[PDB]
Amino acid sequence: IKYTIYNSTGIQIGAYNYMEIG
């Protein structure tokens, strides 16, 4: 999986991950 993304807020790619940006 490529993508390219500039200085933006933290990303989950791939399968259905879990993540909690307080």
GROMACS .gro file of N, CA, C and O in nm:
model
   88
    1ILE      N    1   0.088  -0.116   0.000
    1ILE     CA    2   0.000   0.000   0.000
    1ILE      C    3   0.093   0.123   0.000
    1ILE      O    4   0.164   0.142   0.099
    2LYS      N    5   0.090   0.204  -0.104
    2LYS     CA    6   0.165   0.330  -0.109
    2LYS      C    7   0.105   0.432  -0.012
    2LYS      O    8   0.161   0.436   0.101
    3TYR      N    9   0.014   0.519  -0.046
    3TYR     CA   10  -0.010   0.656   0.005
    3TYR      C   11   0.114   0.744   0.012
    3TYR      O   12   0.232   0.712   0.018
    4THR      N   13   0.085   0.876   0.013
    4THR     CA   14   0.176   0.983   0.054
    4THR      C   15   0.094   1.098   0.114
    4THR      O   16  -0.003   1.133   0.041
    5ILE      N   17   0.127   1.149   0.231
    5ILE     CA   18   0.043   1.241   0.310
    5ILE      C   19   0.137   1.341   0.380
    5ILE      O   20   0.228   1.290   0.448
    6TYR      N   21   0.116   1.471   0.371
    6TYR     CA   22   0.197   1.571   0.442
    6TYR      C   23   0.155   1.577   0.590
    6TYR      O   24   0.056   1.513   0.626
    7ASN      N   25   0.233   1.650   0.668
    7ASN     CA   26   0.224   1.678   0.812
    7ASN      C   27   0.080   1.708   0.858
    7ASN      O   28   0.037   1.822   0.870
    8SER      N   29   0.006   1.599   0.877
    8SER     CA   30  -0.135   1.595   0.921
    8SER      C   31  -0.152   1.490   1.032
    8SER      O   32  -0.055   1.423   1.070
    9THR      N   33  -0.271   1.477   1.088
    9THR     CA   34  -0.291   1.412   1.217
    9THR      C   35  -0.295   1.260   1.198
    9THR      O   36  -0.345   1.217   1.093
   10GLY      N   37  -0.244   1.187   1.296
   10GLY     CA   38  -0.189   1.052   1.282
   10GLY      C   39  -0.288   0.946   1.234
   10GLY      O   40  -0.400   0.948   1.289
   11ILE      N   41  -0.251   0.864   1.137
   11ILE     CA   42  -0.340   0.794   1.046
   11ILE      C   43  -0.327   0.645   1.081
   11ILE      O   44  -0.212   0.607   1.110
   12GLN      N   45  -0.436   0.569   1.076
   12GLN     CA   46  -0.437   0.423   1.072
   12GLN      C   47  -0.473   0.379   0.929
   12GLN      O   48  -0.575   0.426   0.879
   13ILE      N   49  -0.388   0.301   0.865
   13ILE     CA   50  -0.409   0.232   0.736
   13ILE      C   51  -0.408   0.081   0.763
   13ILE      O   52  -0.333   0.042   0.855
   14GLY      N   53  -0.483   0.005   0.686
   14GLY     CA   54  -0.470  -0.140   0.670
   14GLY      C   55  -0.600  -0.210   0.705
   14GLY      O   56  -0.706  -0.158   0.666
   15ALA      N   57  -0.596  -0.319   0.781
   15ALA     CA   58  -0.717  -0.375   0.843
   15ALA      C   59  -0.772  -0.281   0.951
   15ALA      O   60  -0.697  -0.193   0.996
   16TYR      N   61  -0.898  -0.304   0.988
   16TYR     CA   62  -0.968  -0.244   1.102
   16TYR      C   63  -0.884  -0.252   1.231
   16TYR      O   64  -0.888  -0.336   1.316
   17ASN      N   65  -0.797  -0.149   1.244
   17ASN     CA   66  -0.721  -0.118   1.366
   17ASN      C   67  -0.812  -0.059   1.475
   17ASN      O   68  -0.932  -0.038   1.447
   18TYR      N   69  -0.755  -0.033   1.592
   18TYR     CA   70  -0.814   0.049   1.700
   18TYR      C   71  -0.713   0.155   1.747
   18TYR      O   72  -0.594   0.123   1.756
   19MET      N   73  -0.759   0.275   1.777
   19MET     CA   74  -0.672   0.389   1.810
   19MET      C   75  -0.755   0.501   1.874
   19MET      O   76  -0.871   0.516   1.831
   20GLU      N   77  -0.697   0.572   1.969
   20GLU     CA   78  -0.767   0.659   2.065
   20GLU      C   79  -0.685   0.786   2.087
   20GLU      O   80  -0.606   0.795   2.181
   21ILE      N   81  -0.704   0.883   2.000
   21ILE     CA   82  -0.632   1.011   2.001
   21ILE      C   83  -0.706   1.100   2.100
   21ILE      O   84  -0.797   1.174   2.061
   22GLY      N   85  -0.665   1.097   2.226
   22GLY     CA   86  -0.718   1.188   2.325
   22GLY      C   87  -0.675   1.332   2.301
   22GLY      O   88  -0.566   1.370   2.344
   0.00000   0.00000   0.00000
